[PDB]
Chains A and B, each alone.
Chain A
Amino acid sequence: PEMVRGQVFDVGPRYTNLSYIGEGAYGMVCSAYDNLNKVRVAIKKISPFEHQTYCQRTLREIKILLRFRHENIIGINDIIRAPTIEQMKDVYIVQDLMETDLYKLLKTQHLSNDHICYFLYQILRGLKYIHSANVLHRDLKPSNLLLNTTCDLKICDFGLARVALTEYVATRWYRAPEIMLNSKGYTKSIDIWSVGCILAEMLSNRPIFPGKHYLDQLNHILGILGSPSQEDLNCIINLKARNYLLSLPHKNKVPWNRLFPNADSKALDLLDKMLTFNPHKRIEVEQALAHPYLEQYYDPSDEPIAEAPFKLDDLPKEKLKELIFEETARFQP
């Protein structure tokens, strides 16, 4: 059995010639040669059965990705795990190999307006399918937008997706303000906010709302958007959250063209509509795709939706391990 950076990868004999790619907060990813299909693939190793939250992430990602089929969403080609549930301690998820991700790209190069337009289009085209299935991704960020040399884009990492929060995550910089204000009742609009953050980061190679915690992040958001209007304060129903906002000093709105003086004015108009504090007035995915900035790509005859919308948190880790064993049985010889 081959080892990569000290960790075992028991994926043979089908997959061989491993090479380290990277790691998130929950899995180690390598590339490998698929001796059946005669191409190189990506393989993510997960060891989730010790913790409630790990099991949930694994079961959610597998159940969703096995049922999604879309050009801008990563697929699962295979799943490897032990033939018995007692020997099952790792899961290996096999996917199409991509070359990089938007996080790593933005650390290395400027994006032209043409790049930004095409990437944004693909993010929203994928999100149009996800939302048509009544699913929220809930964790869109540059590191889970996979890319290849021809600028094809695929959304990945569905471990936090839910059908329409305390766990550890690598970054909270893309979360909507209504999550930070404990408004609860989150909608598809939280995904649009994240796309707004990603668009801003493509324009400047810098995260727009960094912060060391939600209080700091909210100050960054309010330092750009300005203090919320009276009408915006009414969308914050939580007693303490609304009082907190009222306790803050007034902050003026910063024009988008001052923060991004070289950006396409059409890109800034769409950015303004995605980074709307009020989630009910935030632009929806279909209206975003129809925005003038994306006019050269908007093509509703070539933007598929889910044929049917989808319709666990109280289960112990042993029961979740059973369900994981069950959803993965189809890939056993």
Chain B
Amino acid sequence: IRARRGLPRLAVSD
């Protein structure tokens, strides 16, 4: 979802 909508990557480790 985030990638398709152009939002920055959200990683589990952060």
Residues of A within 8 A of B (CB): 71, 100, 105, 109, 112, 114-115, 118, 121-122, 125, 147, 149-152, 297, 299, 302
Contact = CB atoms under 8 A, between A and B. Distances in A.
Contact of A105 (B1, B2, B3, B12): B12
Contacts of A114: 10
A150 B5 contact: no
B10 A118 contact: yes
Contacts of A112: 14
Which of A114, A150, A299 neighbours the largest number of chain B CB atoms within 10 Å of its CB?
A150
B1 to A, nearest CB: 7
For chain B, the bracket of interface size reads 10 to 19
B6 to A, nearest CB: 12
Contact of B1 (A109, A115, A149, A152): A152
A112 B11 CA distance: 11
Nearest to B11: A149
Interface of B is mostly: loop
A302 B2 contact: no
Contacts of B9: 150
Contact of A115 (B3, B5, B12): B12
A314 B3 CA distance: 46
Contacts of A147: 12
B12 to A, nearest CB: 6
Contacts of B14: 112
A66 B2 CA distance: 26
Given A151-B2, A151-B10, A299-B5, 8 more contacts: A121-B1, A122-B1, A147-B12, A149-B11, A149-B12, A150-B2, A150-B3, A150-B10
Nearest to A100: B12
Contacts of A71: 1
Contacts of A105: 12
A118 B5 contact: no
6 contacts: A71-B1, A118-B10, A149-B12, A150-B12, A151-B2, A297-B1
B11 to A, nearest CB: 6
Contacts of A152: 1
B14 to A, nearest CB: 8
A149 B12 CA distance: 5
B13 to A, nearest CB: 8
Nearest to A112: B14
Contacts of B3: 150
A112 B12 CA distance: 9
A100 B13 CA distance: 13
Contacts of B11: 149-151
A98 to B, nearest CB: 12
